Design a protein around this ligand. Structure first.
Ligand SMILES: CN(C)N(c1cc(C#CC(C)(C)C)sc1C(=O)O)C(=O)[C@H]1CC[C@H](C)CC1
Length: 557
């Protein structure tokens, strides 16, 4: 029951790949230790193939089936609709991978006859054939990190025509089902501020809280044919059109369960019998399966009053403590149960009795103070990867602007405000590009965002306190400072000076630009303004943000 089998053909690049951090005139203003930053390339694909290839064994007990029955009962309340061809086309990112059948993402978005005809033919074929595995392409991802190097992650995805069909059959399902099945445990329904609120309120709801994150080793590879069929059985609990039931059955049999892997040059690389990382159902499937396995494991371990928080393969559990010794024993039992279910750990879990010490989705809860001096909880993370990616983006235009996504998601943090806002608004000003919409990703979905709208977005998501936080925790301050020394980033005095300059120039522009100056950089001046609500904020349609996760699912808004 191997996760993959391989022919020996190589995983190949579809374009020239750079590993070394590109440098321009702006690089040193952000960081000096350039050799610390790198991008992964296909040259390490082989190392990744070795790590992701293993046999899976699965022993399923009564706890597992009990939880599954409960999940199905909730799923049976869901009613889901097919998307029209047009609706599905409009969810396609403008720069999504072109089809091998003579049309591209722009053709799809424009409803061109060629694209629409092909999409219709793929759909008809899904209804007519529920057996033949569907081809997929395997690629090595090019992602940027700071040293201590990782081998490239792999991405596996079907052709554009198939991706459009996935949306038609399953977009409504994967957008609505998880919150119904998992309720408050479904992580993607929360903005960062809402996630912090759920965590804190959950922590406070326990008499003696204990919590832990659980890291499954190579989660996608641990997902078995059983797991993927169980996921389909959950989808089929929904009230669906018969046409939708057939398309979903077909996609499960032909795509989700496994299929051939083809490299960028059309060679057969091998065969997958685990989760594909680049299909619409990757996020929802991982979320449901992680939740199922973990909920059953809690019962096997006899953890008391477990509250889970699940985002794909990312898992946090907060429960009622039974004592330090009992807690540690129960956690080992939990891990043993997860392992029997084919979800063994990478790092062994550790019980935590301080909420701020739990890291999940690479983030943690921390505390600062607003202008009135009151304690405010917010979401932060180690800034190392955000800053390394920011350095790459300083010198190269890339498909996704991580710096923009990070400012949005981590707006209240010491590091995003001091460094990312300052650095990138300086660059935007110099190039007169403040109004140019840029692509970023939020929970895996792609969004086109004008940087001038940032103050409203931030106020809607985080509230006005995001612009006045100060007196950060010693732990957070030290982590940021350590990162700055590691990468060779300039000191606070430098950033404050640059911020005052950026702010001054923004104010002189008037309009939204002045709003950016006033709100984003109020922290940098001696005599601070008392910030009030931004009128146009109400106008933004953020209904669609923070509904569901779409990592790998080729979704655009
Ligand atoms: C108290 N004063 C000196 N601070 C302030 C500066 C801090 C720092 C730092 C290093 C990581 C460079 C060591 S923490 C902090 C703190 O407020 O805890 C502020 O006013 C900050 C408010 C937020 C803004 C983005 C940057 C300045």
């Amino acid at each position: 029951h191997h996760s993959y089998t391989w022919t020996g053909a190589l995983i190949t690049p579809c374009a020239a790949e750079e590993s070394k951090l590109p440098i321009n005139a702006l690089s040193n203003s952000l960081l000096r230790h350039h050799n610390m930053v790198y991008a992964t390339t296909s040259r390490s694909a082989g190392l990744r193939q070795k790590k992701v290839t293993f046999d899976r064994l699965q022993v399923l007990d009564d706890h597992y089936r009990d939880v599954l029955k409960e999940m199905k009962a909730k799923a049976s309340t869901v009613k889901a609709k097919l998307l029209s061809v047009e609706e599905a086309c409009k969810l396609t990112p403008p720069h999504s991978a072109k089809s091998k059948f003579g049309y591209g993402a722009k053709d799809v978005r424009n409803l061109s006859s060629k694209a629409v005809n092909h999409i219709h033919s793929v759909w008809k074929d899904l209804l007519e054939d529920t057996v033949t595995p569907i081809d997929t392409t395997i690629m090595a991802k090019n992602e940027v990190f700071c040293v201590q190097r990782k081998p490239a992650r792999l991405i596996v995805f079907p052709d554009l025509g198939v991706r459009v069909c996935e949306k038609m059959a399953l977009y409504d399902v994967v957008s609505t089902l998880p919150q119904v099945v998992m309720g408050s445990s479904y992580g993607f329904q929360y903005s960062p501020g809402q996630r912090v609120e759920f965590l804190v309120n959950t922590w406070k709801s326990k008499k003696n809280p204990m919590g832990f994150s659980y890291d499954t080793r190579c989660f996608d590879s641990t997902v078995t044919e059983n797991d993927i069929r169980v996921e389909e059985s959950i989808y089929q609990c929904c009230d669906l059109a018969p046409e939708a039931r057939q398309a979903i059955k077909s996609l499960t049999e032909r795509l989700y369960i496994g299929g051939p892997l083809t490299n960028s040059k059309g060679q057969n690389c091998g065969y997958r019998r685990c989760r594909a990382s680049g299909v619409l159902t990757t996020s929802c499937g991982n979320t449901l399966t992680c939740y199922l396995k973990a909920s059953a494991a809690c019962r096997a371990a006899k953890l008391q009053d477990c509250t889970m928080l699940v985002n794909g393969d990312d898992l946090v559990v907060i429960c009622e403590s039974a004592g330090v010794q009992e807690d540690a024993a129960s956690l080992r039992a939990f891990t043993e149960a997860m392992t029997r279910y084919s979800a063994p750990p990478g790092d062994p879990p550790q019980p935590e009795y301080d909420l701020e010490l739990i890291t999940s989705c690479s983030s943690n809860v921390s505390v600062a103070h607003d202008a009135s001096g009151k304690r405010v909880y917010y979401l932060t993370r180690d800034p190392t990867t955000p800053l390394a990616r920011a350095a790459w983006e300083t010198a190269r235009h890339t498909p996704v602007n991580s710096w923009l996504g990070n400012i949005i998601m981590y707006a209240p943090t010491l590091w995003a405000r001091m460094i990312l806002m300052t650095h990138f608004f300086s660059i935007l000003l110099a190039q007169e590009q403040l109004e140019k919409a840029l692509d970023c990703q939020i929970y895996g979905a792609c969004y086109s965002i004008e940087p001038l709208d940032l103050p409203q977005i931030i106020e809607r998501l985080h509230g006005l306190s995001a612009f006045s936080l100060h007196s950060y925790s010693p732990g957070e301050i030290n982590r940021v400072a350590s990162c700055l020394r590691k990468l060779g980033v300039p000191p606070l005095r430098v950033w404050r000076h640059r911020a005052r300059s950026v702010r001054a120039r923004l104010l002189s522009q008037g309009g939204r630009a002045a709003t950016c100056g006033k709100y984003l950089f109020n922290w940098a001046v001696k005599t601070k303004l008392k910030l009030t609500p931004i009128p146009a904020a109400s106008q933004l349609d953020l209904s669609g943000w923070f509904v569901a996760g779409y990592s790998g699912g080729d979704i655009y808004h």
